[PDB]
From a paper:
The crystal structure of TcSMP was solved at 1.62 Å resolution. Crystals belonged to the monoclinic C2 space group, with one molecule in the asymmetric unit and a Matthews coefficient of 2.01 Å3/Da (estimated solvent content of 39.5%). The 3D crystal structure of TcSMP displayed an elongated, “C-shaped” architecture, comprising two lobes (lobes 1 and 2), linked together by a flexible hinge region. Overall, the structure was found to be composed of 12 β-strands and 5 short α-helices with an elongated strand (β9) that stretches from lobe 2 across to lobe 1. The larger lobe, lobe 1, comprised residues from both the amino and carboxy termini, and hosted most of the secondary structural elements of the protein. Lobe 2 comprised β-strands β7, β8, and β11 and the elongated connector β9 strand, plus helices α3 and α4. This lobe was found to be stabilized by intra-molecular hydrogen bonds between residues coming from β7 and β9 strands, as well as by three disulfide bridges, formed by C139–C145, C158–C181, and C172–C178.
TcSMP is a poorly characterized protein, reported to be involved in mammalian cell invasion, with an auxiliary role to gp82, the major adhesion protein of metacyclic trypomastigotes. It is highly conserved among different Trypanosoma spp., making it an ideal candidate for CD diagnosis. To date, the function of TcSMP remains to be elucidated; however, knock-out studies carried out on a homologous antigen (43.7% sequence identity) from T. brucei (procyclic-specific surface antigen-2; TbPSSA) underlined the importance of the protein for parasite transmission. In this context, we describe the production and high-resolution (1.62 Å) crystal structure determination of a surface membrane protein from T. cruzi (TcSMP) as a potential serodiagnostic antigen for structure-based in silico epitope mapping and design.
Author numbering: 41 to 254
The structure:
Amino acid sequence: QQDLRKAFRDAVNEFNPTPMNAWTGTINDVPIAVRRESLNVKGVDGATSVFAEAVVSVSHMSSSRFQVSVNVRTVTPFNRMAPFRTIEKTSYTCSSRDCKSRLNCQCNELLNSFMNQCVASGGKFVRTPGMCVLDRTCGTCERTVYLRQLYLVVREVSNGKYAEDTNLRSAMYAFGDLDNDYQPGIPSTVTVRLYSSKDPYIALQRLTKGTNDL
């Protein structure tokens, strides 16, 4: 869609990265650092993100409610409750690469491996009734996954003044409370970023629905 490329260019063209130069301070007491990262969008050289970043401890976490206290100059202080864990549902489907022929099929092996990893994660494994052969879904796993990266968003309230964006909970599409990076296993730290709502990364995420293509 050629309108997408133009809409992205316009968003980049209008992005002023200089207010973030005033961003200093802490996230959960960890001093932030501001980074400039090229989005490497061809033909759009100004497509450069500018965000604050802090790697913060989560070794106190026992619950699902991770609290993130943002104390950055020119940003109104706010405390975000972020979901520390969520349920991931996956399935194992018997594919051609795992099933060279009907007589030499390895799908049962990889189903058993899927089951064992599910169980070792504390998940619920359910075997699908019927034989596990080509192009069938053979099992599901419902397991808990844990936050790795939290990209918060602030918006301009007045000139050179920012506040927590109550609409964009995350800079990652689809920008909601659970649109963060979750992975199996309990981490020791979480990487927290702070983006302006005008950041080209968010424009890119929005126009490509998180795919970052076009």
